[PDB]
Amino acid sequence: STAFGSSVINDFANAGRQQRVVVQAEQAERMTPESVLRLHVPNDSGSLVPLSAFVTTSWEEGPVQVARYNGYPSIRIAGDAAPGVSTGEAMLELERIAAELPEGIGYEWTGLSYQERVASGQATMLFALAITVVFLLLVALYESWAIPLTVMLIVPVGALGAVLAVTAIGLPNDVYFKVGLITVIGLAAKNAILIVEFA
């Protein structure tokens, strides 16, 4: 431990800072496996016994890094999808392949993938709640149902404009486009009321 791993002995009081004196074997005396054998240790009778007298070095392969996720051993596999291809389909492909793994090997998502998962989950009923609430507000204000359904027919035109524009320039369906779409929907609704209340 002391010769090859370096051992911290005690505290060096370096002009007011408490740093640690470190002991390690010399650079020339720890550069080869033979240097491990050349180290000596003391026996009970006071002589020094070389390591090579009772140790034999055998090579094998091992982990320089062990990765564990939620307490089990893991491999962290990362990459990026092909250009022009959605990430959701990539998660679909990855889970499909991971299903072909031998039983006992689990696959989990982490960070960005987990966040993308929950986002894609929540978007739909977010839209639904928005639409039902605007309907209810519109029936409240117009003291009717037909006029609410009338005005609510407006939003697909704003959605169509946003979608055609983004597809023409080719941008993805990111959060920024989504909020742009929602504010466009809001202004289109404002337009629709500004016509229909006077009507």
Binding site: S1, F4, R30, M31, T32, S35
Partner: protein, 149 residues
């Protein structure tokens, strides 16, 4: 031998060894194959522990741990024991986190346990004796009935 000797032999001989790696930083400008030293220090099974040397002579004769002690894999603690209907059993108390559904959590636990029971040893079986969610399920299903009726 005294019990201090056996304790100290166990303490120094059953210890993990942070050996290191040759060619480590600061490394010579010449050498280029650092690699781990991975000494085996701790003992895994009762056979290895019974091979702890208590006293070895120059001739070769040795006193291994097993020669004075019986070594086996047992409980860290024998204060408490549990039985379930006259047969030796084990049990755990699962507690609900704050601000969480019980019925869903109970169903998740039961489904997980039944899924794990597929991998159980055949001699052992699982059973959930106590469930605080059953009372709530019957209570809500009755109260809904009372509201409707």
């Amino acid at each position: 031998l005294s019990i201090d000797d056996v304790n100290n032999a166990i303490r120094t001989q059953n210890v993990q060894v942070p050996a290191g790696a040759f060619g480590s930083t600061p490394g010579s400008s010449e050498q280029e194959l650092t690699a781990t030293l991975t000494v085996k220090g701790t003992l895994d099974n009762p056979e290895e522990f019974a091979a702890i040397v208590l006293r070895a002579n120059q001739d070769g004769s040795r006193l291994t741990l097993g020669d004075v002690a019986r070594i086996e894999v047992g409980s860290q603690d024998y204060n408490f024991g549990s039985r379930q209907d006259g047969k030796p059993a084990v049990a755990a108390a699962v507690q609900l986190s704050p601000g969480a559904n019980a019925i869903q959590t109970a169903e998740a636990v039961k489904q997980r346990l039944t899924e794990l029971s597929a991998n159980f040893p055949d001699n052992v079986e699982f059973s959930v004796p106590y469930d605080t969610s059953r009372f709530v399920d019957v209570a809500i299903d009755k109260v809904i009935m009372t509201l409707i009726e």
